[PDB]
Amino acid sequence: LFGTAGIRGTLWEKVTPELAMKVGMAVGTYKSGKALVGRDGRTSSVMLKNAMISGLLSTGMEVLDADLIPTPALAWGTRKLADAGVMITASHNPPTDNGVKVFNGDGTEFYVEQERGLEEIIFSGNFRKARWDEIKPVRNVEVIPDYINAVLDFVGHETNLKVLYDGANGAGSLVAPYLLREMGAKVLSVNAHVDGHFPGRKPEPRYENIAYLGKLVRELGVDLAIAQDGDADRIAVFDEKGNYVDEDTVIALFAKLYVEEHGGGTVVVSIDTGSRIDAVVERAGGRVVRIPLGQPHDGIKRYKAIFAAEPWKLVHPKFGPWIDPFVTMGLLIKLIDENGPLSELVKEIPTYYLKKANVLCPDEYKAEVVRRAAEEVERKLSSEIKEVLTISGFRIALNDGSWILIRPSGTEPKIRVVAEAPTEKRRDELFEMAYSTVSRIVKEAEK
Amino acid sequence: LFGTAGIRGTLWEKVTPELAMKVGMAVGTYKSGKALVGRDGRTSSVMLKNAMISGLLSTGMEVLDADLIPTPALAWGTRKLADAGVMITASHNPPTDNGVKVFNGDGTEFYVEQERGLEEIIFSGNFRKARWDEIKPVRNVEVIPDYINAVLDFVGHETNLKVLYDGANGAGSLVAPYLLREMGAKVLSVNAHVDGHFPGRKPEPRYENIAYLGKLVRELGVDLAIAQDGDADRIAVFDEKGNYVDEDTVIALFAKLYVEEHGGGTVVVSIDTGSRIDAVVERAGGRVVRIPLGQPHDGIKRYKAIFAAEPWKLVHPKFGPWIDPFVTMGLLIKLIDENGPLSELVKEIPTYYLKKANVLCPDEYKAEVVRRAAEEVERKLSSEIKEVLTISGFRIALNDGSWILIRPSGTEPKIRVVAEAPTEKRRDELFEMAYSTVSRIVKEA
Amino acid sequence: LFGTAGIRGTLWEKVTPELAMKVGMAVGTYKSGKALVGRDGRTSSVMLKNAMISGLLSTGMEVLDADLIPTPALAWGTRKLADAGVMITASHNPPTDNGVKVFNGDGTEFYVEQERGLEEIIFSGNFRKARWDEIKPVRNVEVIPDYINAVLDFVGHETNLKVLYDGANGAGSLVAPYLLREMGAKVLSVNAHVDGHFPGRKPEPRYENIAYLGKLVRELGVDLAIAQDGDADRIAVFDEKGNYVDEDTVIALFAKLYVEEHGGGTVVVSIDTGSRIDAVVERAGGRVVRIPLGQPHDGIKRYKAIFAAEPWKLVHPKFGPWIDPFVTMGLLIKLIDENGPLSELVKEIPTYYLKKANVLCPDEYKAEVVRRAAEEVERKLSSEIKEVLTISGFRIALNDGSWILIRPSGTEPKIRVVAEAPTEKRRDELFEMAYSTVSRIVKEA
Amino acid sequence: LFGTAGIRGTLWEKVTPELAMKVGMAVGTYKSGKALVGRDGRTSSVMLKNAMISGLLSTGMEVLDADLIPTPALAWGTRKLADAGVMITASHNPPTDNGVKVFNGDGTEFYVEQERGLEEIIFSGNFRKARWDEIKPVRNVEVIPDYINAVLDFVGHETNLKVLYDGANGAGSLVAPYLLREMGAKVLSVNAHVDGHFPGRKPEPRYENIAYLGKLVRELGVDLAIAQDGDADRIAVFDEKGNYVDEDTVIALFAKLYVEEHGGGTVVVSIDTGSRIDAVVERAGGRVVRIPLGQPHDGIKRYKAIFAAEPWKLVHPKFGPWIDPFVTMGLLIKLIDENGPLSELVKEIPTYYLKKANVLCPDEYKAEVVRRAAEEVERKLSSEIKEVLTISGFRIALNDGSWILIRPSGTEPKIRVVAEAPTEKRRDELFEMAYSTVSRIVKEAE
């Protein structure tokens, strides 16, 4: 059931009312006391929330119903109010899809160990049943105003910046515009009316889904563009010139800020974030530990990290251990007002050049093909190896700051192939090697 | 799954979230358009309503959420607003129980065809599945105030009577006090805070549960007492003396007034309602048909009748097809204001005397036992037999207005034994005979 | 505008939407930050709450709207949530009336200088005005469940008692029956549906408005009857024998309880409470001080008291400064469960005999009549005299524990007369002296 | 208290909680039965709505609380649900201001006679007071989804057009995006999160507040842009090329559509809508009658009109006697899908050239300066006069389709001066004559 980022899938195939009721029933067998429930704007979300609540109620848990809320606010509100938290969302997936994310009473997403717990209870049907006289009444709660205040107290900044905010027709529309305006920003919102058909654009704030914003920034005269996904756990940014600031740069900006403050410390990033981060962290005298994509919070506990991130998701541990783009965009505005325009701050981040691509493989082979292709690429680059990470596929780092990721995704039946180098010519050289080496090996096992 | 009146049963045994959702899914596979959804105050109802609503939504039906409402208001609202109605309730059962009642867009409970249809669909697992872009938002609706206005306009009576209302800690507490006050009634309410532990009393307004009201009537100086079940589709009444006005006298009163205004016409009642009703209806020039316990309005269509009833449950078809105790309490008060105290109006209703007991019998041998027992009673009394009905067990009617009913039960494993006579002796004789005939057959096989 | 415990009067006469708006304006000129807003169930209370809320918002205060909650829950919620509280209510006044009560961030009612401060601002019309961009959104808050949990945690007692709860169709109906149920009590409720017409009875839980409850306690076999007013700040109790436990007996029971645990300590009662409190407190080695009818907490601050009370209104300082009958309720159940049936417990209380009546008197002839009709009775009986109190009219205490009270009413044009003595004779002779001493000096002018 | 379109003003100066409570007390003295109450997103709207409901309750009226709703949804819901309608809004004014609009049970705005009735009642203090036992409980109602269903039913059109919707941070944002999506439109919204600070732009959809939209239309490849005000009773449009379609062109598309349908009929437009209406109405065999600003509904009963409009505000009598930009945007999409791109459709509208400015005049003179100036411009144009309307200021129509408006606004120390002509030279020449004539006569009385 759980992938890397919760339970996610297409309606009727994987995600059903029946399952959502099973997950509530399992959350109230594994955990007890109070459950904070929230949902995103998808057409199926109220249907799945009513199932979830039916499930949670059946176990004797007191349900606190927050209804339509961004995921971060559900994580924050869970810490403040509840013993467990449940979010109805498929985040960045199309409107055919929904899912469930589960949170603990400290605001952290479920650990791998806790997910397997919940699945064992679902597979067994061994659910805690309340007596009739232990079934607690639902309590409606209003979290967004408290969340917005907690984010303004944390950020401690006033602005006059003009800001373009793109809400993907999602839960961020009920929080980001108001937060920015409270800070004294002049907000021009796009896709900031909540709509589960995602009429504005595909909700995932990939560059190709939000490219129009770069043009909007120049015409409008804004200091900064901010885009989100449907449950607003992601953040994407454009500068005052309408340049897309890519995800590694956004992370590098904060990785530098955090390490320089502390005069050092551990930063934790995903296996698939690049050398912009190692570059600015080492120069300022801290270190980088890489972990699998999915659990940026996990790294904080293990490595005592001051900052953790994956592409589009930063964690601000002094605020709390959830991905918090509301903190992120608040602090990005403080960075600009305190140091000058965003395009000049991105110049102080070194250029690397990434090139990724999927290369299709059956799920039966997947793992064999990666293991055999990592060995071959290592051998061909043996003169240049700095380190091989094995924690999530194979990340091969080279002496000059280049690296290759060869990794199977947990879901789709294919292999992820990333290469990054300090030059375009070498981005191309290494990507070709990695791509074609995987391509050729795939078609071997396929005959 | 469906008995006489909805799906009922105990939490976790037969009634679950899983089933509540499958029923929603079934209703939205069998019908389309709008579902009006309501619940009573049991501790499990919001949980089941959540599951139900998930069900309904998954089929592309547009849910209207009326939340905590009495069943008659759900029936009325279903006719105003929706193509189907669903009610989370077990009406008069203990706090441990809940269930679902399903209504059509004209306000009638499911007919047997439609119950079976729904049962097949659940068994099949073949539920209609909306596409993501056909799942409809929930609409919250406030029914009670419009329901109250509709009763008030139908009854068209102001009053100054003092009324004692017992809402059985249930859904009636949100409606009857306010309808009585709007009519002019001075209401003293008991058990009129909503609570699914039913702390005040067992919710079923059987005399044995509501008999304290008798003495309360005396002290408080009230004209009338009204008592209800947890979803408020039952009504029981006490008079100004504090005397219980049993369920046939109540039906008799309504039978009498309906057959008079008309100048005759048909009155459908249950197979277990006795001769108080036959007496007033023939005297005022009308006829009585009988059906099985379940939906009095089945009768109305079938026997073009002007009134129908079972014990506690009266239908006023000029208003609508559903059991409507809110109409009943409004017309009882109108009756009294126009004609004089209730105790006076009940003297003008012939006495008969009823004794009833249940004899346990396995759900398996029920048809078998009755069969023999009834033909034995037919033989032992053959000189007197005026009529035998086989529609629900056997109702053996004698020449001297007496009768014996020997009926198999539905949701319990017992046979139901009843006698009505015009004397305490002729009663005691026909019952302590009829009971021991069934009793002795059950002690063989 | 303010009397002893709030602004109150007749709709359209003294209390208007206009006044309700000016008070909101005045509160948010005198204070800043957050205002918690609550109301009782009177017909006019939503109209005045809207006017009140418009007032507060206009000053830049952040309004927290609790809607329909009892006064104690508003005072409790104010301490938890806000810088000021506002209650729309006239507590025990008839349905023709409403009012406002203003609370501080610690949950105390308006102190006199706040009252005067507020009145000058209203007369002046110089109200703080928010700029457009400082008017704050209303926040809806659910207080009752949290207030219920706070009271349970403080009473620390589960029971199995049967209890008769009479909510005067008022705000207590949404709270008492559920607090009693979560403890384990089997609640039988009367007048426990909210109704601003107060159909059940006069909302003031005077013996003669709630008399009927006595013969009802016997009938149902309850261990205790509890009655409140419409805002539920008041409590009145009958025992399992259906004997009215008069209001000093209740006070004395808690007096005894609070002083015995402590080993002495001081007890603030109002000037018109009797010798029952004097006796159980001295006996237990504690000290009794009298203050005027108003706010019993003024006593806790001044005299570091462990317990304050007036007739029908107890304060439990360990919980909070407000009159809290939800705490009284629960500690009284815990008393009975720990020391036996209530009728027994009221026997361990000394008996005195009380009589009172009102003499109509113009406002300008109150200051005059009393002082000069008290000079007189002070001289006649200056043999016995143990102490005269003049802090609130004249209260003449004798050496045999007897006493007389002549007092000018706050909010009505009449002189109040009270006599109490250890004996049936000594009582009836004092009341008849003092009552006709006034009546006579009235017809001088 | 009432100006053109309801009671409007700056917070604390004219518009107060105490005023809003008086207006409620007045409406429940002038009218009986049920009152539907709505508001816009202004920071003061909840404060004034609470005061309004307090007033209305005090008179025994049954209050139906629709909360935050656009004005057109309030007029339609009033017709469905109630005997009176109240809207808390200052519509297009800055966030410093608020206001009250009142509506009859048939969904018409209050007539001048009805406004005086209310003002007298407010000025006398003689409000109907309910007895305690007649104060009715407030009923919360959900109008928007019923309203969207009625507009979709009335429009009878499915689409796949791309559409830029600009909600000006206002009540339109809760209806227009959903009504467009349900028609099949691919909606990209700007300023479609409600906020009383109007952070996106000034909510009045004059061209100069919404100029940026024309630029976004091109970049984004949209077929149509639609911009509204704060209460969404106004509509403004840009075509697929980012061309601002001016308010007379929008009215004219619809005058022509309505007059071609009926082969004739009367169209009622305000005194300051110009000649492109006359061109398409006469060419299809209909006639144009003019009335003053603010009363476009008054045309329907008075002149039996099939369509009525003033700049930004169109009435579709067959749906209701209120300004309904939701019906408008729906019918524009239907127009475009059935006839071709918007830019092509506006080419079939004859070109006139307008030029407007104000001239400062003390309130004490105003009337005198306009009367004298109009007599003087008439005489100078005497060889050319088609018609001179006096119903609101002086509108001087010439034989060639040109015209001059000289009008004192009934709320400000200035005189409004319009001139339109088939040609640029004639525009300039006629505007030069009228502007300078008025400008001179002002300073003599000084």
Residue numbers in the entry:
A (entry chain D): 3 to 449
B (entry chain B), C (entry chain A): 3 to 447
D (entry chain C): 3 to 448
Paper text:
Thermococcus kodakarensis, a hyperthermophilic archaeon, harbors a novel enzyme (PPMTk) that exhibits high homology with phosphohexomutases but has no significant phosphohexomutase activity. Instead, PPMTk catalyzes the interconversion of ribose 1-phosphate and ribose 5-phosphate. It contains the active site motif, “TXSHNP” (serine as the active site residue), and “DXDXDR” (the metal-binding site) conserved in various phosphohexomutases. Thermostability analysis has revealed that PPMTk is highly stable at higher temperatures with a half-life of 90 min at 100 °C.
To understand this unique property, we crystallized PPMTk and determined the three-dimensional structure by X-ray diffraction at a resolution of 2.39 Å. Crystals of PPMTk were grown in 7 days as needles (0.1 mm long) in a monoclinic space group P21 with four protomers in the asymmetric unit. The structure was found to be a homotetramer. The crystal structure of PPMTk contains two monomer–monomer, and one dimer–dimer interfaces stabilized by H-bonds and salt bridges. The protomer was composed of two main domains, the N-terminal domain consisting of residues 1-350 and the C-terminal domain formed by residues 355-450. The two domains were linked via a short linker (loop 26) forming a deep cleft. Domains I, II, and III consist of a three-layer α/β/α sandwich each, while domain IV has a two-layer α/β sandwich topology. The N-terminal domain of PPMTk was characterized by low-to-moderate B-factors resulting from stabilizing interactions between domains from different protomers within the tetramer. C-terminal domains, however, were not significantly stabilized by interactions with other domains. As a consequence, their B-factors were high and their coordinates were less well-defined.
